[PDB]
């Protein structure tokens, strides 16, 4: 499925992910797309931070969902 | 009507409110339900942050609406 991740600066990145893919898979996709390390990225879905062990289906992430990416130092 | 509030931990809180009820009443209900003070709570729904001087009908909040709660430190 196609998903969109928005950062705090307004930049939106489109990725191809599956519902069974974990949040770590989304972090790896974002690292491939932009170069941000997975440990420096925080993913939020529906106002709640997504866990790396949990998947997109566990977080009820559907097609064309809007995830939130937060940078960390 | 019944409304849903999503927290950062994934817990969903169901609240009984009316369209004429202000966001201050919703903050008081959230304080009665979870103990979070109204000064440290921010409500986000339909692309706009909830204002204390506005009502649910002004924000076009209908039955079974899903808003998000953000806790300030």
């Amino acid at each position: 499925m196609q998903i969109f991740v928005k950062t705090l600066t307004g930049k939106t990145i489109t990725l191809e992910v599956e519902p069974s893919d974990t949040i770590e898979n989304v972090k790896a996709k974002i690292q491939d797309k932009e170069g941000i390390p997975p440990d420096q990225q925080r993913l939020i879905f529906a106002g709640k931070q997504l866990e790396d062990g949990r998947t997109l289906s566990d977080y009820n992430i559907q097609k064309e969902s809007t995830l939130h990416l937060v940078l960390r130092l | 009507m019944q409304i849903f509030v999503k927290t950062l931990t994934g817990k969903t809180i169901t609240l009984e409110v009316e369209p004429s009820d202000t966001i201050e009443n919703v903050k008081a209900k959230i304080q009665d339900k979870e103990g979070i003070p109204p000064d440290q709570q921010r409500l986000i729904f339909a692309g706009k942050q909830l204002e204390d001087g506005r009502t649910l009908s002004d924000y076009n909040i209908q039955k079974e609406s899903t808003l998000h709660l953000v806790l300030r430190l």
Partner: peptide, 29 residues
């Protein structure tokens, strides 16, 4: 929206980072 919440959570995240920098500048000097 989720973008609004992202910007807000980044706002308190940067505020926590700046308080950490305050503590740093406290005891390095």
């Amino acid at each position: 929206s989720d973008l609004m919440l992202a910007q807000m959570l980044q706002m308190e995240y940067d505020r926590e980072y700046d308080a950490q920098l305050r503590r740093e500048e406290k005891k390095f000097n």
